């Protein structure tokens, strides 16, 4: 990982090329709450659907959805969980989600300087409730953090973002925001592909983190 | 310190007093010594205060990280075994505490853990300095056929009888009832004051 | 191990090319139980058949079948055994098999970042009984875990999986699932090759791990 | 040493004396034992001097770095938990101090922290060697319905009553009042001398 | 504590009481001090509780990993040699226990292991504080020609005679019989109560 | 990072090429005070504007504005904060800002010798009040410090510096210096681009660090 | 040591090319016993024949014959001896020879991953008596273990194995198995070469390890 | 403990008793304290048991690895020098034993090694607590012109005379005779009982 | 130091090419004793002949003669001396010379695996008296040990060995063996070169190590 004469890091660009082959994921802020939506393209009938978790919990207030290489994603989710519990031991509670994202992203940045290790090929979306309320973040394999209001990661990112800068409005209720996210996820797919049941997770201010069950998602289709 | 754990069928009742004392001197009349570690699990601390609070923060982190990584709450024998391995790895620079762990994992359990990591399960246990007075009440009045309300009244009688004869014990009684149906339920102050005033006790 | 401009890791792809030259192996979940079937192509008459173990036990509840390079497979089975005994010392019992698979796969992922070491050329199948019941897992040389219901690894993977998405049904008994796995393993072979006695291992919920003896397998042929 | 913390509704009043003593010998007649750690937070030290000053410098750094990194002041339970984790990590090569932390985080709080890291919240606390005389005044004259000026007069009476009967306590009284509206306000020497001279006290 | 191991032809009978005591105070009336380490092997702990439980967890891991890696159970002299090497590597930060290991490896064996790692095989051994009363019974009534049922009745008489004269021993007797045919068989409570009540004993 | 036969370090030159793609930033000394101005080109309507901070505080007397790669910028700002708090613990106060800049720049120089690590692609501007009064500094990815009176970093550096060696005069008041910096920042933009509300921060001697709110900036436009 | 696009490790293949230039060695299981036969081509009359040991003892129950580079062979025999004595100190006796072979082969595997070290160019044959009786093993420079009944290593491996899958029968006595191994070793040689006195070592179940003296070998020729 | 080593021409006779005692209490009536380290070499342990057994396992490994690497048995002065270097490298965390090493290397040798590593060769040595009684017999009845059978009868008389007057010594006598012709020969129990019963001794 | 596709180590072959440029040296076993003979081609008259030692003592019973690079030879002789004194401290005496040679050769082998260090370009001849009597050894830069009865190392090795497989007989006296070694050393030289006084050292069983003085060598010419 060294500089190109253009002023570019090539391993980070190629890591983003590895990110562009993951599953499409959304994060949407609604009226006192955050949504995370992930696509669940289970191809074979032999994959157990009881334990495919695309939306990982880091805390019962804080969740994240990953895209890219799934093994590096599992490593970064485990680091995010251990860092969250270190902040709970040291201080007593998790006051800001942004510094959890900064610890994960400062783990991801460190592998884009040292020569004996490749970057992570994972982009993440963090989401939760802290003292500043509902917060949503995006983390780029260079270690780049951007706080958002609606975002997508994965293969069909540009179709979803291009849908959500013409169809998204600020203070939706929960059901309208889920319906908007589902038709965004349909707008990412080309014809021939129908959505099998995706995974939707929500949190509102004051409550804990609620993951939707199956028949509610099939009703929301 | 006075600390009670009672196993009933489908229920675990744990309770304490609230006094923090410096050698004869009541430093704080309202401590907190009964904690919820997991959704169906509560521990209860006795001994030195700072060590016990560090153990509470560590066990909340370990049980929550276990629950997130494994999608199902930690069994109670594994909680007590985890505290046993933790407390025994020092053993010579020791944590000078004694702990109770109570919970529901398709069976109610109460584990008593000492300062060197010896975890022993029993049907009722009691730690603290007011421990033998509680054991005196529970040897004569405990029965395994009691309901939950008779259990709560029993633990209130035991801690009241320990408060009368121990000077390091006193204050308001904190009772928590752990069931599978309702979970960890910290009983309110008004119900405990109603049971204390109803049974003929002045605390 | 660095990124390709396509967003690919070449040493992981070549490691999968090393996995495609191993013996074919099946794992099948049946009604309260798991099967592992492995092919036992002993070519010479001089190889001792008393100690060729293709199905390795990690625990008397948990077993694994490996494919790829056999030396790296032996190393990963030894690491899985030591990790299982660490979980039994620390906690008292093994509550979830998935975290054993995550410790093995997080060992396998770590060699796909650091430059001074090559990846493992081994794919594994884990299987056993825990508190969630019968569980079956597959682990990919990138360190990628997928929980399954029937799977194959090795050279003839695609013939067996292509057989088991048209011939597999959910709650078979033990003998019907063994018979289905044996005719799957025959469906992997081309003509001219007859099965010499493969190795079959089974576990049911509550019991320990039962490995079939010789004449029962020859009766099941 | 004498050190008082008082929680009133929307207010925290903390105060000390100023004498530094070497075993019977008044080395310094004007110390500084009441510090501002954060915009709405003050701690108050007692015990050995060098350890306590190191703790003050460290907690000013930790709370300011927290405020810069997180855009909002640290909660008081997290300040006391941070001192508890810090003081308990040594525990055998210990800091021989005892501390009060008081502040406003949409609720007034006073935490008392000992030399081993046991942080206990209470409505009024007092550390030092003149501690039991302050506790004697506050058991009989404290009320939770007091205003801020009655609170300041109460703490002046408590520290004056501790200065009469403790030889390691004395000097000018430093009072600081912490509110959400005005913040941390170190009361001037002239107002404290006016309240001492007004209440009938010669100090 | 009271702990008995008896070697008979083709049989090993090991047994204990169940009382856990804090200096005079019966903390737990039902402990567990007789463990199954391997399919044909059981150890039995005495001394400090947390150290002994750590040794039990470690030896279960070592013997199961040995059995998986080597396809045949560990010999008993290797179990006792493994505990001897483990207990002797500390020796100055010691595990303060004493242990019995009994098993079948085409010969019945009972090994007695102390706190510094000296493993000695003997035909009958006994550890604990009630040890000399057991040795008093076994010096006069043990014979190598006994059957298994006469052996079980002998160990029940020995532990009953130790329970009468030792205050740190008491509770229900746990007996386990290890044979090649049946394996490690923990005898039920009803059969032991039947043998206690049959031989004229009130426990 | 080795020498070229011309006597040049190529990774430092390419790092400066990475610096030339950042947002344009100004620092201006006025009469007992320092200004920092940063451009806030938020493109999407979906980026949360409540927490985009371009002007980072290191101390309530000392601030810095960064340009280049944003992840390395976050790392250098965190190192500057920890170094500032070490100087406050050791000594009691921060007497000179120049040695904070020398500790950051001696962190940045160290990666331009050792072969196992690439240089930082970040240029920084430090600013604050110490005992020598108002001080302004610039730090170059080789680790090069220059104390200035008005400066720019980023993409449009040369237009702003070329504006400020013909339009800048010494002892301006605060409002005149802000107005000069805003028309400098307009002089950097080409036509078609209008300034959306930039971020302006100021400090005067004796007071603490004052960051302008929104409607004051829109009035200053 | 990295992967080839075919899925091959080239340093292991070249290490096997270094193994194919060693002296030919046999191991044969007979009725309650194991044989090891090694060729002793001493060319010069100046080499002392009193201390040329081709069959190395690791234990008075366990022996091994090596082929390939003789210095790496000496290192692996010394590691096998130290590992055997560690198993005797820790446990009291050596219950299984297979785990000694797994410790040697897990030493040999470790140098086929790490980049700062080349593989061992040595193939070994282990042989001895444990509680499972007579056992014979073969270890491959990748670290690959195969339990056998008759085997060869070295230059003339294929002639000896090709002789022993047509001339070997199971429960020979000792003298018939030695005579079969000697005519196998003659079958490896081309014409013009006569066997000077090879080295033969035997063990039976219950006894210790017996190495044949000189005139018994010359009688067995 | 009682431990004898006798050098005769072409012979080394070493012998012990078998009692293992805990401060007055005969824990084991059959220990093993006479070991074969090499084909022509035997050591004999006294002192603490676990340390001595660790030393026996280590010296069996070192002498067997020496014999395999060098094709000829280790000389006895090198065995005693190896134990001297081993025991002296700790010296402050010491092995609390005392050892005899006897063997044949074209000359019979007996080395006495203490807990700090001072190895001294002598024609006859004796370690243990019953050592001075053995030295009393060997001062008056040893002669360098004795045969092997007179030597065995002498060591039986010496250990019997030590068993009569030491309470920590007792049990069956283990005698081993080391010659170049026959090697290390552990004499059977029947021959030793025949020599004890023949010489007029009841043991 | 990696493998060639032929199965060769190139740095070891090139190290042997560095060995073929050293001074010619002999070692000869005679009747209860060992000889070492080394050539002493001092070219300039300015080299002090009082301290040119070609035959180095490692012990007053054990000596060695080196060839190849003289600095690596000095390092290996110093390691051999320290290892000999470690064996005398640990055990009390030096019972076998072969394990001293195995410690030196296991030092020399270790640099033919690790990549950060080149092999030693030195071949050595060890010689002395132990309990097995007179022993003579040869050590090869791969770390290869061969026990001999007469040998040569250096530039003229093949002429001396070719002389000593037609002119050497077993139990010579000392003077006849010295005379045979001197005419061997003359047989290595081409015409035009006369031997200036070489260095001869001898040991007999029971005595210590005797190095010949000057006029005895000139008489032996």
Curated annotation (Swiss-Prot), chains A, C, F, G, I:
Biological processes annotated in GO: proteasomal protein catabolic process; ubiquitin-dependent protein catabolic process
Subcellular localization: Cytoplasm
Cellular component terms (Gene Ontology): cytoplasm; proteasome core complex, alpha-subunit complex
Family annotation (Pfam families): Proteasome, Proteasome_A_N
Keyword list, A-Z: Cytoplasm, Proteasome
GO MF, any single term: endopeptidase activity
Means of activity regulation: The formation of the proteasomal ATPase PAN-20S proteasome complex, via the docking of the C-termini of PAN into the intersubunit pockets in the alpha-rings, triggers opening of the gate for substrate entry. Interconversion between the open-gate and close-gate conformations leads to a dynamic regulation of the 20S proteasome proteolysis activity.
Primary localisation category: cytoplasm
Stored InterPro entries: Ntn_hydrolases_N (IPR029055), Proteasome_alpha (IPR050115), Proteasome_alpha-type (IPR023332), Proteasome_asu_arc (IPR019982), Proteasome_asu_N (IPR000426), Proteasome_sua/b (IPR001353)
CDD domains assigned: proteasome_alpha_archeal
Effect in UniProt of substituting residue 70 to D/G: Prevents PAN to stimulate gate opening
Effect of residue 69 to A/E/G: Prevents PAN to stimulate gate opening
Domain of life: Archaea
Post-translational modification note: The N-terminus is blocked.
SMART domains named among the record's database cross-references: Proteasome_A_N (SM00948)
Claim: NAD is one of the keywords in the record: no
Other remarks on this protein: The configuration of the closed gate contains an opening large enough to allow rapid entry of tetrapeptides but able to impede the entry of proteins and longer peptides.
Stated role: Component of the proteasome core, a large protease complex with broad specificity involved in protein degradation. The T.acidophilum proteasome is able to cleave oligopeptides after Tyr, Leu, Phe, and to a lesser extent after Glu and Arg. Thus, displays chymotrypsin-like activity and low level of caspase-like and trypsin-like activities.
Family indicated by similarity: Belongs to the peptidase T1A family.
The protein's assembly and partners: The 20S proteasome core is composed of 14 alpha and 14 beta subunits that assemble into four stacked heptameric rings, resulting in a barrel-shaped structure. The two inner rings, each composed of seven catalytic beta subunits, are sandwiched by two outer rings, each composed of seven alpha subunits. The catalytic chamber with the active sites is on the inside of the barrel. Has a gated structure, the ends of the cylinder being occluded by the N-termini of the alpha-subunits. Is capped at one or both ends by the proteasome regulatory ATPase, PAN.
UniProt name for this protein: Proteasome subunit alpha
Swiss-Prot record, chains B, D, E, H:
The UniProt record lists the keyword Zinc: no
Subunit structure: The 20S proteasome core is composed of 14 alpha and 14 beta subunits that assemble into four stacked heptameric rings, resulting in a barrel-shaped structure. The two inner rings, each composed of seven catalytic beta subunits, are sandwiched by two outer rings, each composed of seven alpha subunits. The catalytic chamber with the active sites is on the inside of the barrel. Has a gated structure, the ends of the cylinder being occluded by the N-termini of the alpha-subunits. Is capped at one or both ends by the proteasome regulatory ATPase, PAN.
Record EC number: 3.4.25.1
Identification of the protein by name: Proteasome subunit beta
EC class (word): hydrolase
Family: Belongs to the peptidase T1B family.
The UniProt record lists the keyword Acyltransferase: no
One Gene Ontology MF term: endopeptidase activity
Database matches in Gene3D superfamilies: Glutamine Phosphoribosylpyrophosphate, subunit 1, domain 1
Catalytic activity field: Cleavage of peptide bonds with very broad specificity
Keywords in alphabetical order: Autocatalytic cleavage, Cytoplasm, Hydrolase, Protease, Proteasome, Threonine protease, Zymogen
Further comment: The configuration of the closed gate contains an opening large enough to allow rapid entry of tetrapeptides but able to impede the entry of proteins and longer peptides.
GO biological process: proteasomal protein catabolic process
Principal localisation: cytoplasm
This protein's GO CC annotations: cytoplasm; proteasome core complex, beta-subunit complex
Notes on activation and inhibition: The formation of the proteasomal ATPase PAN-20S proteasome complex, via the docking of the C-termini of PAN into the intersubunit pockets in the alpha-rings, triggers opening of the gate for substrate entry. Interconversion between the open-gate and close-gate conformations leads to a dynamic regulation of the 20S proteasome proteolysis activity.
């Amino acid at each position: 990982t060294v500089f190109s004469p253009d002023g570019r890091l090539f391993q980070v660009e190629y890591a983003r090329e590895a990110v562009k082959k993951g599953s499409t994921a959304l994060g949407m802020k609604f009226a006192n709450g955050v949504l995370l939506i992930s696509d669940k393209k289970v191809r074979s009938r032999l994959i157990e659907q009881n334990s495919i978790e695309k939306i990982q919990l880091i805390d019962d207030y804080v969740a994240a959805v990953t895209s890219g290489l799934v093994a590096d994603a599992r490593v970064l989710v485990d680091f995010a969980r251990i860092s969250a519990q270190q902040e709970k031991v040291t201080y007593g509670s998790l006051v800001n989600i942004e510094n959890l994202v900064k610890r994960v992203a400062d783990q991801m940045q460190q592998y884009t300087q040292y020569g004996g290790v490749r970057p992570y090929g994972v982009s993440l979306i963090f989401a939760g409730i802290d003292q500043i309320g509902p917060r949503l973040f995006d983390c780029d394999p260079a270690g780049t953090i951007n706080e958002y209001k609606a975002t997508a990661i994965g293969s069909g990112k540009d179709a979803v973002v291009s849908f959500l800068e013409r169809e998204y409005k600020e203070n939706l209720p929960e059901k309208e925001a889920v319906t908007l996210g589902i038709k965004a996820l349909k707008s990412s797919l080309e014809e021939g592909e129908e959505l099998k049941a995706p995974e939707i997770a929500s949190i509102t201010v004051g409550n804990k983190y609620r993951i939707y069950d199956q028949e509610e998602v099939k009703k929301f289709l | 310190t006075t600390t009670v754990g009672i196993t009933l069928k489908d229920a675990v009742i744990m309770a304490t007093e609230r006094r923090v004392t410096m050698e004869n001197f009541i430093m704080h009349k309202n401590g907190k010594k009964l904690f919820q570690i997991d959704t169906y699990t509560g521990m209860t601390i006795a001994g030195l205060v700072g060590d016990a609070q560090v153990l509470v923060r560590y066990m909340k982190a370990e049980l929550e990280l276990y629950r997130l990584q494994r999608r199902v709450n930690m069994p109670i024998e594994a909680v007590a075994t985890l505290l046993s391995n933790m407390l025994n790895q020092v053993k010579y620079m020791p944590y000078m505490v004694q702990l109770l762990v109570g919970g529901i994992d398709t069976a109610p359990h109460v584990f008593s853990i000492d300062a060197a990591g010896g975890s022993v399960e029993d049907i009722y246990a009691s730690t603290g300095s007011g421990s033998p007075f509680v054991y005196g009440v529970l040897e004569s009045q405990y029965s395994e056929k009691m309901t939950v309300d008779e259990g709560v009244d029993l633990v209130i009688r035991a801690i009241s009888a320990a408060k009368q004869r121990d000077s390091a014990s006193g204050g308001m009684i904190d009772v928590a009832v752990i069931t599978r149906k309702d979970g960890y339920v910290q009983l309110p102050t008004d119900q405990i004051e109603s049971r204390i005033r109803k049974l003929g006790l002045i605390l």
